[PDB]
Amino acid sequence: ANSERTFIAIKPDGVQRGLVGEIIKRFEQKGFRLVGLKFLQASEDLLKEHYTDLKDRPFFTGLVKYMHSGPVVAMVWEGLNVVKTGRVMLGETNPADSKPGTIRGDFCIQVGRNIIHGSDSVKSAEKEISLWFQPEELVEYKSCAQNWIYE
Amino acid sequence: ANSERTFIAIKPDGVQRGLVGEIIKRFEQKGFRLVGLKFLQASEDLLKEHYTDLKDRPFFTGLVKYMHSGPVVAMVWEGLNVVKTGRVMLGETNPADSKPGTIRGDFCIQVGRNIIHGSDSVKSAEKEISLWFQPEELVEYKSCAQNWIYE
Amino acid sequence: AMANSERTFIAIKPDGVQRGLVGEIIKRFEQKGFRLVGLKFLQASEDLLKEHYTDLKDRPFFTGLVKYMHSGPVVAMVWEGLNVVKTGRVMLGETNPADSKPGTIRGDFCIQVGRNIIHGSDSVKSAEKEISLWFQPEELVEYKSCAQNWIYE
Amino acid sequence: MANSERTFIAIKPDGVQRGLVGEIIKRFEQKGFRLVGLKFLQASEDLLKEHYTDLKDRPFFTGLVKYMHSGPVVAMVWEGLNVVKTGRVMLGETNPADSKPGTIRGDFCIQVGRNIIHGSDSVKSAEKEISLWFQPEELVEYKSCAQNWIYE
Amino acid sequence: AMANSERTFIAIKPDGVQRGLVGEIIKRFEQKGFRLVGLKFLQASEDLLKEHYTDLKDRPFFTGLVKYMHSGPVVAMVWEGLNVVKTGRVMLGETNPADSKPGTIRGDFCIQVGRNIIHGSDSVKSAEKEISLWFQPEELVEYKSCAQNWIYE
Amino acid sequence: MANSERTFIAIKPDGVQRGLVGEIIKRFEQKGFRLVGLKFLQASEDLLKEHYTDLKDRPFFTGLVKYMHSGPVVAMVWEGLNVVKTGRVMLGETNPADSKPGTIRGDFCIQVGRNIIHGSDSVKSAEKEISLWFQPEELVEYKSCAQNWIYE
Ligand SMILES: CC(C)(COP(=O)(O)OP(=O)(O)OC[C@H]1O[C@@H](n2cnc3c(N)ncnc32)[C@H](O)[C@@H]1OP(=O)(O)O)[C@@H](O)C(=O)NCCC(=O)NCCS
Ligand SMILES: CC(C)(COP(=O)(O)OP(=O)(O)OC[C@H]1O[C@@H](n2cnc3c(N)ncnc32)[C@H](O)[C@@H]1OP(=O)(O)O)[C@@H](O)C(=O)NCCC(=O)NCCS
Ligand SMILES: CC(C)(COP(=O)(O)OP(=O)(O)OC[C@H]1O[C@@H](n2cnc3c(N)ncnc32)[C@H](O)[C@@H]1OP(=O)(O)O)[C@@H](O)C(=O)NCCC(=O)NCCS
């Protein structure tokens, strides 16, 4: 319950525009803990399975080639309702709909360059975590401030 | 008209997690003027009178003992709608409903660990102010910017 | 593309300069993805403010608004980007800071309606009128931003 | 006994009026030191004169007392290893024109007569100043959750 | 007085503008306690820069410096206060960003010397030469900060 | 060339538990350096030994390996002109008491036994450690879009 995990990935425009540290900071100060972290240049084959739900969409080719044109920061975060609250912290998928104070609302403009991706559901979280991370690369530890975050 | 006061308290999980300065900062940059500030470990008796409207709730015992298990920072802020807008700045009482940009929305997760308390009304404010503070501990002064914060 | 070149006029009111919010104000517009086209430091005359606020000359606060806008220096800015008029309003917040949400410029830094530190063009033609009013075409600097291909698709 | 040394930190009236209170506490909190005492107060010229008793012969003594009395102060007591020494380093030089960027004074003030913050110059100056503004009641003892990550 | 009003000329270079460091630089001078007197956004010409760097015409990097300062728009600013020429130079950092200390402007956002984001008047005399060069007397705004009596005794 | 030099920067277990990861990365990003390698790992007691092989004859070597092993670390590789030397300056002195405000250790830690972050002391140390924590596959080469504004 207090160990739910979600997949968060900083897109190539986030790395290029230098927003990797700020994004990691909003999740740290919130109270979530990092379980996995890697710096990687994804293959278009990997992205196709990650975006297999959108293969019918007209933007699919441009989305896969944009996600491949640069490195990404693949993370795994853990905490009570990390999937949902993470989506709230991220904002709406279109930055034009995001409210200020959200990651997209403070840092990006266009839908095709929305700097960050969050797992839309627990089922989408477990599918994406097992896709980008192996079980070895996920680190298990207890934050020194757990008893001050949860009861 | 601009002299209304509210009671703001940083809960024991807000002191332990190093969130005291940032919390005071949001009320300083907002345009509010600090009137009372103290550092205190509230006795269970001082808390039960503060939470007397919640004595019939099942969590009342765990709420008092958690608020007593650590020191709190008790503050009094004055300004136009410092009670109401203070509730807005704090956000919703359960952090899972709070919006990003609010204090709880940026820094905490669970309801029982929401780092901060605010007065819910002008009637709650007066009672809470007169309960934790004596009339002398309250400092009355004029901010050098009040002609730029108010007209 | 030609839509990504949309422009808006953002002014930092005298209370925003006095309370030292100019750099933080420009920071939210820089970190968002928008580009600086014009920037000047000015003391607007009452005559200049009246034409800028001509659609409020019937309101009772008009005289108090113009003199307060003239009682100090302002920071006139022009910004460009996709929906810079509409999203700038969002980042600014609601005109009354008691309505603004935390995270907005007005929600985070100001209290009273008469001292809401910042102005934003409400529409594209209000932006078109306000940019041509405070800026001459010479004062506007068009440059390609080094991260443009990472802001846009 | 060194992971318990306390120092007295005071935010001057100009530090409050300009709204640097949370910013000052933030640097002490993130540094690793623990907040032991806190109070908001408009100092009387009596306690000021005992606080600055070492400067009674200096020409600025009168203007310093009435300035520190012209507004409210935030009186703080911080605990940690060498909090008296590294507290002075964090503060910067007493003349803000001598403070280095990154310090509280080097970042936030200009003139020496308005240097927003005061630091205890020594452990003996601290315990005198601690006993001056703070009674042993108003000092809170507790263990921070990250102490074992701050100390060995 | 006169000392409580000395002016310097701090310029944000094109790499500071391109990398989104305009708001951060203004915020540091604001929170220091200095008074914004003038501010302009400008693509300065090769000729304006030659006179600005006239004491460096006999240096091999002089031609690549003027073309880099012309390759983008700059933020020209004027700040007023006590010892703001000197203190501003300490805030900027050392001109070689590898010598600038952390906490300075160049120590925090700069690596190479040919890309040192910002310039500061080295002396009061260089200030009054540079200020009169980039700005006209009209564009300089004199006003009284609301916190002056808490910055100066 | 010298715009491509790399260094090895690790965030110790106390830097992670006290939530400093995003801040440490942000200071390197805003400086202008490029992120080359990034991983999150619980280093084994065999890995930090060869990392701290020069300190095996120091009395603290035992408590340092097991402290480095007591939590997860964030191993990083950064590339830029003089990133090894300028990395050390940004970190500050190894003894946080000697670190200057504005550095990572002058802002965020107190004790030598808990200085949150590590930096490569030299180019040859950097290349020895980069090949110790990272394999050539995990290092991502990409041209930062603002390169022509960071370097001339
Ligand atoms: C919406 C509702 C259903 C739930 O919201 P709620 O969190 O329980 O109610 P509140 O937000 O007003 O709680 C206020 C305080 O109680 C605490 N609290 C509330 N629920 C808590 C819980 N489940 N566990 C621990 N603390 C809780 C909160 O920490 C909060 O702290 P605060 O001083 O900072 O404000 C609420 O309206 C409700 O409970 N109504 C019925 C209350 C009632 O009938 N009381 C009579 C006796 S049962
Ligand atoms: C919202 C509206 C309907 C009137 O509501 P309102 O309470 O006046 O709030 P507004 O949105 O008009 O605020 C406009 C400005 O008037 C000023 N203002 C508003 N209320 C004020 C008050 N009580 N005292 C002083 N100034 C006030 C503010 O400065 C405000 O923000 P700005 O300076 O950044 O522009 C207004 O949009 C309106 O009058 N529309 C009709 C004509 C028009 O303005 N059209 C817009 C162009 S399409
Ligand atoms: C390491 C050495 C330089 C002296 O150490 P120093 O003066 O304290 O400063 P340094 O930064 O250079 O190295 C100190 C290391 O020892 C650790 N250390 C020192 N004292 C410690 C203590 N009491 N407890 C825990 N760790 C300690 C430090 O944590 C640091 O490791 P870190 O980077 O993770 O923080 C010395 O032992 C030496 O000569 N080493 C040779 C290795 C080298 O640098 N070769 C370069 C060839 S070009």
Domain ranges across chain F: 1-152
Catalytic residue among D87, D118, D120, D129: D118
Say if residue A5 carries a ligand binding annotation. Answer: no
CA angle A58, A50, A128 (to 5 degrees): 150
Q: Are A88 and A11 in contact (CB under 8 A)?
A: no
Residue of F101, D97, C137, F85 lying closest to E96 (CA atoms): F85
CB contacts of C109 in chain B (<8 Å) are: 29-31
Q: Are A21 and A80 in contact (CB under 8 A)?
A: no
Q: Are A71 and A40 in contact (CB under 8 A)?
A: yes
Say if residue C7 carries a ligand binding annotation. Answer: no
Pairing of strands F117-118, F73-79: unpaired
Distance (Å, rounded) from C-alpha C129 to C-alpha C110?
27
Q: Is B117 marked active-site?
A: yes
Q: If DSSP codes are grouped into helix, strand and coil, which group holds residue D9?
A: strand
The method recorded for this entry reads X-ray
Q: Which helix (DSSP H) or strand (DSSP E) does residue D17 occupy?
A: helix D13-17
Q: What are phi and psi of F94, to 5 degrees?
A: -60, -35
D16 to B52, B79, B135, D24: CA distances (angstroms): 34, 16, 20, 10
Phi-psi region of D115 (alpha: psi -120 to 50; beta: other; left: phi over 0): alpha
Tokens of A57: 């969409």
Q: Are D105 and D93 in contact (CB under 8 A)?
A: yes
The closest residue, in CA terms, to atom 40 on ligand 3 is F54
> Which of E107, E147, E153 is facing D67, going by the closest CB pair?
E153
Q: If DSSP codes are grouped into helix, strand and coil, which group holds residue E39?
A: strand
Q: Are F90 and F107 in contact (CB under 8 A)?
A: no
Instruction: Measure CA A14 to chain center.
Output: 11
Characterize E89-127 residue by residue with b for buried, 16 or more Cβ atoms within 10 angstroms of its Cβ, and e for exposed: bbbbbbbebbebbbbbbbbbbbbbbebbbbbbbeeeebb
Tokens of D126: 């601290």
Say if residue F3 carries a ligand binding annotation. Answer: no
Q: Quickly tell me which residue has 């596959």 as its tokens.
A: F137
Tokens of C152: 């846009």
B112 to B62, B95, C89, D78: CA distances (angstroms): 9, 9, 36, 28
The length of chain A is: 151
Tell me the residue type at C112: Q
The span from the first CA to the last CA of chain A, in angstroms, equals 12
Mutation for F interface: C31, C146, C150, most F CBs within 10 A? C146
Distance (Å, rounded) from C-alpha C20 to C-alpha C16?
6
Residue of E11, E112, E111 lying closest to E52 (CA atoms): E11
Tokens of C21: 């919010």
Side-chain-side CA neighbours of F133 within 13 Å: the count stands at: 29
Q: What are phi and psi of A93, to 5 degrees?
A: -55, -35
Q: Are D79 and D144 in contact (CB under 8 A)?
A: no
Q: Is the CB of C114 under 6 A from ligand 2?
A: yes
The span from the first CA to the last CA of chain D, in angstroms, equals 13
CB contacts of A40 in chain F (<8 Å) are: 140
Chain C neighbors (3+ CB pairs < 8 Å): A, B, E, F
DSSP 8-state code for residue E143: -
Q: If DSSP codes are grouped into helix, strand and coil, which group holds residue F91?
A: helix
Would the CB atoms of B150 and C112 count as touching at under 8 Å? Answer: yes
**Closest approach of C96 to chain B, Cα-based (Å):** 12
DSSP 8-state code for residue A134: -
Nearest CA in chain A to F14: A144
Pairing of strands E118-120, F34-41: unpaired
Helices and strands (DSSP H and E) totals, chain C: 8, 4
Distance (Å, rounded) from C-alpha B16 to C-alpha E87?
37
D113 to D59, D71, D94, E35, E138: CA distances (angstroms): 12, 14, 10, 18, 33
| A107, β-bridge pairs | none
**Closest approach of F53 to chain A, Cα-based (Å):** 25
Tell me the residue type at D84: V
Characterize B110-142 residue by residue with b for buried, 16 or more Cβ atoms within 10 angstroms of its Cβ, and e for exposed: bbbbbbbbbbbeeebbbebbeebbeeebbbeee
Distance (Å, rounded) from C-alpha F68 to C-alpha F48?
7
Tokens of D115: 């240097």
CB count within 10 Å of CB C64 equals: 12
Q: Quickly tell me which residue has 């909190």 as its tokens.
A: D29
CB contacts of B147 in chain E (<8 Å) are: 146
The span from the first CA to the last CA of chain C, in angstroms, equals 9
Would the CB atoms of D31 and F110 count as touching at under 8 Å? Answer: yes
